[PDB]
């Protein structure tokens, strides 16, 4: 499917020619800290 290439040297120029922004972020606390004895509230970095 790739065509007898390493795809890295090709992919570099492919991404150079056509480019779009990409969004990345990290959440540290999700707000539903669960244990085998039930759920517990926590700060929610995803949404409010």
């Amino acid at each position: 499917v790739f065509g007898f290439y390493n795809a890295w040297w090709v992919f570099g120029e492919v991404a150079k020619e056509l480019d779009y922004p990409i969004f990345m972020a990290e959440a540290e606390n999700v707000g539903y800290k669960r244990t085998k004895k039930g759920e517990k509230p926590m700060p929610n970095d995803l949404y409010d």
Partner: protein, 475 residues
């Protein structure tokens, strides 16, 4: 195991008529004129104090109390009650709190063998509330004498009445009321007072003075490495808190070679760009590497009969292999010699938490016996003309290696994030001249040697503080 033999009548010792092996390992006919709980101490029923809200009180669980009878309380205040510490306030509201009266002793009820007995000193201020998981006793005899007689001595009779019962080995007030303290052991200590208090007070204040200047094994490495290179440690910890990186499509293949675009890699790039803004001595490590031999990890039994094997707990922030093997195998692989530690070897940890993966250390310890290093160790025979292995290991243990390996460690399971040879070959670390590398090594060798000497004197004092008690009791 043990093989004893008891009688039916011995089941009448406790009104709970228990006949478990652990309890009756200690049960035996007695000839000493034993004392009882009535003469020595008095259990004080716990009550819920009326805590004020303006003043920030200090609370302490069992986990906050240390093995050596030190308390590290948490400062809580109803004014700032967030979700992180909401559980503590839930315990307080339920009623698991009590203020110890001055002079009492608080024995932890769960897991007595840890010897987590704390003494509320008659002097000093800022009293701290405790969880009702402790047990209050009011010593009719001198409080310090009973404290020391319970920590050092009687540590096995208290452990001989704990009740496990499908879970936690716990105690009860009745268990303490059942104890059978001896007379000579306690009267010898009580009579020989007014010096067995002065000597212990002097030794304890010496230990406190020694602890007053103690520093961790990571801050020292951080301090000197921050002294060089002019790194703002406060700003580095602020940029590390950012959780928003917006890279482009083009900047995904830059030095990637395997197309990694996870968030960890893209924050690694930002942190590494920030770190080397003013440093210009950086060359890739892959040039100065000759081999990346891994280790061998056979099925090992703890304290077995065979060749010893190291573990991931034997690599410390100092940069010296602890050489304290625990596990032992008896299996062979026809190539045993290649998996034996040797003096001068450079081992990097492969597989740990996100913060403890990549720790490096030089052996620096002449041991004639053969010890296997597991396959979680990467040995890195390198060019001994530019790197000066000790410098490399202590750089890796520093924040210059604790942030790269925190964001390059590949792995689906975040609890065993691992580093491969590719990360080692593609790590851009700062290499100063050979003369400059030696200066740092001397600093964070002499400082840590002084710190270790501090760590040794305190242990010797804490050992003689109980040797004195033992020799005073048995006399």
């Amino acid at each position: 195991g043990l093989i004893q033999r008891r009688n039916f009548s011995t089941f009448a010792s406790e009104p709970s008529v228990r006949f478990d092996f652990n309890y009756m390992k200690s049960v035996t006919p007695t000839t000493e004129e034993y004392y009882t709980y009535k003469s020595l101490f008095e259990v004080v029923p716990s009550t819920v104090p009326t805590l004020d809200e303006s003043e920030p009180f200090k609370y302490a669980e069992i986990g906050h109390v240390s093995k050596n009878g030190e308390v590290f309380p948490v400062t809580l205040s109803f004014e700032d009650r967030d979700e992180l510490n909401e559980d503590l306030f839930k315990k307080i509201e339920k009623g698991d709190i009590f203020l110890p009266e001055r002079g009492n002793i608080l024995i932890s009820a769960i897991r007595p063998y840890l010897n987590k007995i704390v003494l509320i000193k008659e002097d000093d201020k800022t009293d701290i509330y405790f969880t009702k998981a402790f047990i209050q006793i009011k010593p009719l005899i001198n409080s310090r004498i009973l404290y020391y007689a319970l920590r050092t001595i009687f540590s096995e009779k208290i452990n001989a009445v704990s009740r496990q019962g499908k879970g936690y080995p716990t105690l009860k007030e009745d268990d303490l009321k059942t104890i059978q303290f001896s007379k000579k052991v306690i009267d010898n200590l009580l009579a020989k007072e007014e010096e067995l208090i002065s000597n212990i007070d002097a030794l304890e204040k010496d230990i406190k003075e020694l602890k007053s200047i103690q520093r961790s094994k990571k801050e020292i490495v951080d301090e000197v490495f921050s002294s060089h290179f002019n790194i703002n440690m406060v700003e580095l910890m602020a940029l590390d808190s950012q959780r928003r990186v917006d890279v482009g499509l083009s900047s995904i293949s830059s030095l990637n070679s395997t197309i990694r675009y996870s968030y960890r890699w893209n924050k690694m790039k930002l942190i590494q760009k920030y770190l080397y803004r003013d440093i210009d001595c950086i060359e890739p490590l892959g040039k100065y590497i000759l081999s990346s031999n891994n280790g061998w990890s056979p099925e090992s039994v703890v304290g077995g009969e065979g060749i010893p094997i190291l573990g991931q707990e034997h690599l410390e922030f100092d940069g010296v292999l602890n050489v304290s093997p625990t596990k032992a195998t008896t299996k062979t692989k026809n190539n045993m010699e290649n998996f034996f530690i040797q003096e001068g070897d450079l081992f990097i940890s492969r597989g740990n938490t996100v913060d403890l993966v990549g720790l490096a250390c030089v052996v620096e310890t002449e041991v004639t016996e053969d010890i296997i290093y597991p396959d979680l160790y990467i040995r890195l025979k390198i060019d001994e003309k530019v790197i000066h292995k000790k410098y490399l290991a202590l750089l890796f243990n520093s924040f210059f290696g604790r942030l790269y390996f925190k964001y390059v460690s590949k792995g689906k399971n975040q609890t065993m994030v691992k580093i491969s040879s590719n990360e080692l070959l593609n790590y851009y670390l700062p290499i100063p001249p050979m003369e400059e590398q030696l200066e740092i090594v001397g600093k964070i060798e002499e400082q840590i040697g002084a710190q270790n000497e501090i760590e040794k004197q305190i242990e010797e004092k804490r050992n003689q503080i109980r040797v004195i008690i033992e020799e005073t009791a048995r006399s």
